[PDB]
């Protein structure tokens, strides 16, 4: 059908808008602490701590596979990154402090992305 093509023309554009937003969120991580998944070779017991690991390249695979149906699923993956980090790492660590900054600076980017998805549909 043509009603599945118009559907995909939206999804493709959501994917296009989300690609931009991920780029901005990831620019708030110049240290690249959230670029890659936590290494299981380097933290063998990590899944004993964190059940749903998340990182930017993992969100990227999913993005280019058009696996985000809406902003809300995308936002959930972003909060995983932050929230996992704040649990696994103690408060007086470079990693906990980088998450707090990422969270603060990503508020602004996400605040405008909510308006652009509502606005443009």
Swiss-Prot record:
Cross-link (Glycyl lysine isopeptide (Lys-Gly) (interchain with G-Cter in SUMO2)): 41
Tissue: Highly expressed in testis.
Highest taxon of source: Eukaryota
Domain (Bromo) ranges: 9-113
Residue ranges of coiled coil: none
Compartmental location: Nucleus; Chromosome
Assembly, per entry: Component of some HBO1 complex composed of KAT7/HBO1, MEAF6, ING4 and BRD1/BRPF2. Component of the MOZ/MORF complex composed at least of ING5, KAT6A, KAT6B, MEAF6 and one of BRPF1, BRD1/BRPF2 and BRPF3. Interacts (via PHD-type zinc finger domain) with unmodified histone H3. Interacts (via PWWP domain) with dimethylated and trimethylated 'Lys-79' on histone H3.
Role, per record: Scaffold subunit of various histone acetyltransferase (HAT) complexes, such as the MOZ/MORF and HBO1 complexes, that acts as a regulator of hematopoiesis. Plays a key role in HBO1 complex by directing KAT7/HBO1 specificity towards histone H3 'Lys-14' acetylation (H3K14ac), thereby promoting erythroid differentiation.
The protein's name in its UniProt record: Bromodomain-containing protein 1
Organism name: Homo sapiens
Gene: BRD1
